Amino acid sequence: LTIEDIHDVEELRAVDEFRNLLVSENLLPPTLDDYHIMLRFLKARKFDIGKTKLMWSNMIKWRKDFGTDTIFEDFEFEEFDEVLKYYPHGYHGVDKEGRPVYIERLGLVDPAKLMQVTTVERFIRYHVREFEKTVNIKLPACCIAAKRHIDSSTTILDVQGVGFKNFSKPARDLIIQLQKIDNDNYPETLHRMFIINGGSGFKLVWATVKQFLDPKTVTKIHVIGNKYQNKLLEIIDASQLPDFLGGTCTCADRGGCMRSDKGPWNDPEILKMLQSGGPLCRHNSALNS
Numbered sequence: 001l002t003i004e005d006i007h008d009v010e011e012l013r014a015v016d017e018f019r020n021l022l023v024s025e026n027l028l029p030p031t032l033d034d035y036h037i038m039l040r041f042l043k044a045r046k047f048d049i050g051k052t053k054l055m056w057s058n059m060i061k062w063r064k065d066f067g068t069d070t071i072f073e074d075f076e077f078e079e080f081d082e083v084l085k086y087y088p089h090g091y092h093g094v095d096k097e098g099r100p101v102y103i104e105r106l107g108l109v110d111p112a113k114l115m116q117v118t119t120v121e122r123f124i125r126y127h128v129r130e131f132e133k134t135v136n137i138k139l140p141a142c143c144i145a146a147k148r149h150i151d152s153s154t155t156i157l158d159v160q161g162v163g164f165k166n167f168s169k170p171a172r173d174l175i176i177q178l179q180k181i182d183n184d185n186y187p188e189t190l191h192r193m194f195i196i197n198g199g200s201g202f203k204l205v206w207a208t209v210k211q212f213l214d215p216k217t218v219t220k221i222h223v224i225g226n227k228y229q230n231k232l233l234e235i236i237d238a239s240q241l242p243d244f245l246g247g248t249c250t251c252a253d254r255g256g257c258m259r260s261d262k263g264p265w266n267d268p269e270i271l272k273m274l275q276s277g278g279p280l281c282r283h284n285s286a287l288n289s
């Protein structure tokens with residue numbers, strides 16, 4: 001199967017020069033020997049080979065110390081159904097460019113009930129296990145469905161009713177911790193973010209959070225008030241957008257859009273193409289031979 005994957009000659013050179021540096025210092029596990037993973041790290045440090053190597057070796061040590069390589073089999077997150085009741089979030093369909101759409105209903109987060117049913121450390125380990133599923137299953141499924149290389153998501157954060165007066169220091173610190181793990185270990189995986197239903201109460205929440213965010217991440221974020229539905233329908237087809245966000249989707253047979261995990265990673269023919277299929281990238285295939 002032929003997937004649209006344009007490589008720039010200048011990027012092909014830089015990534016191979018980075019790969020040769022990693023091999024010569026035994027910093028390249030075969031699991032991470034992928035043109036596109038290395039390209040994301042190089043982009044995160046503006047193709048500075050020395051800063052990217054330091055970022056890379058920090059990530060290798062992090063995967064070792066965290067237990068990231070074995071998290072699917074090791075981490076049984078038994079409180080998942082209770083957590084999801086007090087923090088509604090999920091992937092739901094694809095945007096018009098084939099990227100997965102990730103939604104969080106932050107207006108419906110119950111922080112007190114959430115700390116009754118999990119811990120911050122367990123929630124973060126669940127975040128890492130879901131990220132591993134996103135980069136190994138969900139993004140490659142989107143590559144197949146669109147016949148195009150995809151490795152980043154469109155995020156919608158619904159912040160209805162969220163105001164600065166109820167924006168707590170533990171809420172801030174979780175955002176910091178989640179972003180630190182994402183920026184260190186999953187770089188360049190956010191394409192864009194739409195923050196919707198922001199009230200006048202939200203202006204100081206966004207002010208204070210931007211002080212802690214990677215400034216490249218800030219440039220990918222759009223904060224919208226109550227009139228958001230047409231902006232989401234411009235970039236996401238109505239069939240892929242839940243009806244509560246202005247689309248047609250109800251996922252009624254699966255108990256609703258925030259629980260269905262709807263997307264091409266649920267299709268058995270696409271998942272067979274991942275397990276059976278030869279590499280999604282021609283440069284990896286040519287390095288192998």
Ligand SMILES: CCCCCCCC/C=C\CCCCCCCC(=O)O[C@H](COC(=O)CCCCCCCCCCCCCCC)COP(=O)(O)O
Pocket residue numbers: 102104106107109111112114115134152153154155157159162166167168170171174175178179189190191193205209213217
């Ligand atoms: C009602 C209680 C507080 C509600 C939440 C506060 C409002 C948050 C406002 C702004 C957040 C802006 C963050 C921008 C950076 C996120 C970048 C990003 O890509 O992350 C995406 C998801 O977005 C986030 O990570 C957003 C941050 C999540 C955390 C939100 C805070 C939850 C608060 C719970 C409090 C628990 C502790 C309470 C103890 C009493 C996923 O990436 P991808 O699409 O690539 O898979």
Ligand SMILES: [Cl-]
Pocket residue numbers: 261262263264266267
């Ligand atoms: Cl589906």
Ligand code: NI
Pocket residue numbers: 092241242249250251256257260262
């Ligand atoms: Ni749905």
Ligand code: NI
Pocket residue numbers: 005007035036149280281282283
């Ligand atoms: Ni490629």
